[PDB]
Amino acid sequence: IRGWIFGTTLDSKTQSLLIVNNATNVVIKVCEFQFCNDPFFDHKNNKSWMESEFRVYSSANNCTFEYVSQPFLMDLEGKQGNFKNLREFVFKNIDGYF
Amino acid sequence: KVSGNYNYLYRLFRKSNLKPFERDISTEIYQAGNKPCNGVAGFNCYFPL
Numbered sequence: 001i002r003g004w005i006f007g008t009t010l011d012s013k014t015q016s017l018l019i020v021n022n023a024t025n026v027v028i029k030v031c032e033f034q035f036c037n038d039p040f041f042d043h044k045n046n047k048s049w050m051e052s053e054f055r056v057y058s059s060a061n062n063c064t065f066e067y068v069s070q071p072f073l074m075d076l077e078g079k080q081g082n083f084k085n086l087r088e089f090v091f092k093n094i095d096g097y098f
Numbered sequence: 099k100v101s102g103n104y105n106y107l108y109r110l111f112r113k114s115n116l117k118p119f120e121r122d123i124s125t126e127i128y129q130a131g132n133k134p135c136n137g138v139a140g141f142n143c144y145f146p147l
């Protein structure tokens with residue numbers, strides 16, 4: 001799970017918001033994005049190549065906000081065999097404030 | 099500007115009263131006409147800016 005898409009039209013008719021983590025950055029951005037119907041990324045466990053695609057939007061017109069950071073979602077320390085992590089998020093959009 | 103500085107603009111119409119600190123940059127036509135109003139214009143269909 002790299003992130004989320006949010007909005008009211010999802011197709012550059014209105015504004016909409018993009019959250020993603022790629023192979024280095026975390027990025028949050030808000031534009032009239034013409035998103036893809038099947039937005040996704042390829043790795044297949046990095047078996048013979050690493051990250052080399054961005055299939056999420058075909059265009060981004062007048063982006064009114066953007067922010068970026070170092071890679072979020074740290075992995076658990078030390079490991080154990082088939083041990084796993086619960087990641088947990090609440091999103092609210094109230095008083096003009098996500 | 100004495101020629102008129104028409105590069106400053108406001109909104110004349112909208113579906114609904116917006117929420118505080120919402121911001122709407124839609125350029126869709128406001129259908130004050132009853133019938134559906136495809137494309138750029140029609141009877142009481144308004145470019146909103």
Ligand SMILES: *[C@@H]1O[C@H](CO)[C@@H](O)[C@H](O)[C@H]1NC(C)=O
Pocket residue numbers: 022023024025027
């Ligand atoms: C991740 O996406 C951001 C925003 O498009 C971009 O600046 C950055 O170059 C991308 N990261 C990599 C490793 O290319």
Ligand SMILES: *[C@@H]1O[C@H](CO)[C@@H](O)[C@H](O)[C@H]1NC(C)=O
Pocket residue numbers: 061062
């Ligand atoms: C959004 O894009 C349109 C068409 O290019 C332009 O006329 C409009 O001024 C842009 N809005 C902003 C806030 O830049």
